[PDB]
Amino acid sequence: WGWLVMLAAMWCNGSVFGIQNACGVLFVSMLETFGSDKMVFKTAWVGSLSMGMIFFCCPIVSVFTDLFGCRKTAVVGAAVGFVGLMSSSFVSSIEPLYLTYGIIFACGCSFAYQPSLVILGHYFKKRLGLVNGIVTAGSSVFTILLPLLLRVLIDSVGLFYTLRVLCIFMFVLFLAGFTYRPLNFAIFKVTAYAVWAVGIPLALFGYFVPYVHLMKHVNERFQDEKNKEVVLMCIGVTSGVGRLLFGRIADYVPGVKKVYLQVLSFFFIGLMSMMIPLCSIFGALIAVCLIMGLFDGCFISIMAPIAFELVGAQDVSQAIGFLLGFMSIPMTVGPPIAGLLRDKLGSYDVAFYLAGVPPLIGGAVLCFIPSRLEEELRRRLTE
Numbered sequence: 001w002g003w004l005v006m007l008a009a010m011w012c013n014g015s016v017f018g019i020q021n022a023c024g025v026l027f028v029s030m031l032e033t034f035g036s037d038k039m040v041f042k043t044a045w046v047g048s049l050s051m052g053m054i055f056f057c058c059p060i061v062s063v064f065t066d067l068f069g070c071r072k073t074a075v076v077g078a079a080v081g082f083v084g085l086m087s088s089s090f091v092s093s094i095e096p097l098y099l100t101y102g103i104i105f106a107c108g109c110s111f112a113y114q115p116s117l118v119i120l121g122h123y124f125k126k127r128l129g130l131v132n133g134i135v136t137a138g139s140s141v142f143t144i145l146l147p148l149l150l151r152v153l154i155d156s157v158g159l160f161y162t163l164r165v166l167c168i169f170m171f172v173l174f175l176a177g178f179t180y181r182p183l184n185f186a187i188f189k190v191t192a193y194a195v196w197a198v199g200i201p202l203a204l205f206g207y208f209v210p211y212v213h214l215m216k217h218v219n220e221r222f223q224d225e226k227n228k229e230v231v232l233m234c235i236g237v238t239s240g241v242g243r244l245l246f247g248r249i250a251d252y253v254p255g256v257k258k259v260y261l262q263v264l265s266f267f268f269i270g271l272m273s274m275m276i277p278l279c280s281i282f283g284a285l286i287a288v289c290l291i292m293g294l295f296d297g298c299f300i301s302i303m304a305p306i307a308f309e310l311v312g313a314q315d316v317s318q319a320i321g322f323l324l325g326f327m328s329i330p331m332t333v334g335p336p337i338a339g340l341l342r343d344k345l346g347s348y349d350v351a352f353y354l355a356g357v358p359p360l361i362g363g364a365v366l367c368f369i370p371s372r373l374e375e376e377l378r379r380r381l382t383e
């Protein structure tokens with residue numbers, strides 16, 4: 001088995017999130033097929049539910065995996081994902097899609113992906129973090145490359161065939177799953193965690209809007225767009241390097257003392273989102289995309305260490321579970337509201353601005369977290 005555990009974990013992490021991020025390239029043609037009324041409002045749910053259900057289901061998997069074992073639940077996740085992707089075929093209306101794609105597919109994907117971490121632990125009972133960086137660099141490949149394959153694949157055979165063929169990834173995941181073989185509400189009393197856990201979800205209330213609506217905002221330059229997929233590929237091409245660099249950066253002395261760089265990340269990503277609906281020359285959009293992706297990777301990379309910095313090591317699991325439970329909502333509610341925001345009398349021009357407000361509030365809230373304080377001074381002032 002050996003290193004193949006990490007090798008297959010790479011494939012799993014790529015397979016799930018590459019699709020979840022290429023969702024837009026599906027959406028652009030899914031809207032066209034079996035098209036209308038008020039379609040843009042309904043369709044967004046197809047990807048919104050898919051992205052929300054993974055986070056909603058991740059915490060509960062911590063009971064299933066511990067109940068059945070590490071080897072299981074990965075086979076089951078892969079099989080359920082394959083069943084859902086296949087069932088997405090033979091659908092003559094958009095209504096069943098919410099159930100075939102989304103609910104079923106993500107309820108499979110979360111089961112497939114969650115146990116990967118528990119077995120990356122014990123990879124070699126050492127050298128954690130470096131393995132995670134390797135896996136991130138690997139999944140960067142699938143995030144970068146998949147949009148190119150799907151874009152050319154769609155025109156040859158329609159959406160139905162595309163989803164019926166994407167089952168190859170789930171099948172390979174199912175086969176690789178055989179490698180795995182091993183060989184609570186009291187948290188809120190901590191004020192720092194209480195503030196942070198509300199700050200982050202309030203910050204991400206527009207994070208997933210671009211990943212869904214950017215490919216449809218494109219075609220504003222209907223003629224000059226000799227190539228579209230690059231504009232979405234260059235988000236991941238920068239996210240990979242950003243995560244890789246910030247993994248190294250996090251622990252270095254000049255900035256490891258107490259990290260609040262997530263405030264900077266939110267500020268920059270919000271500003272760049274506020275920049276999209278204005279730039280006209282093509283290259284400016286790619287520059288904005290790179291600026292977005294770099295900090296998008298940085299913020300996600302820096303998250304986990306803050307978890308055990310704020311709270312003891314024992315409660316990190318519960319902390320992450322609650323955090324993902326809260327995070328389930330904003331990504332489900334974002335894209336639909338963003339689409340509808342001016343689906344009457346306008347375009348995304350008026351919708352991308354308001355997608356940029358929540359990040360600033362989130363950054364302020366996170367910057368409003370106390371520290372460097374202890375109660376030994378309580379004798380002096382308030383008593």
Ligand SMILES: N[C@@H](Cc1cc(I)c(Oc2cc(I)c(O)c(I)c2)c(I)c1)C(=O)O
Pocket residue numbers: 017021055058239300303304
């Ligand atoms: N849109 C992103 C997808 C993505 C979102 C989040 I939020 C995230 O952060 C975590 C951290 C831990 I730790 C988890 O167990 C989980 I599940 C998600 C990661 I990694 C990836 C992209 O472009 O790839």
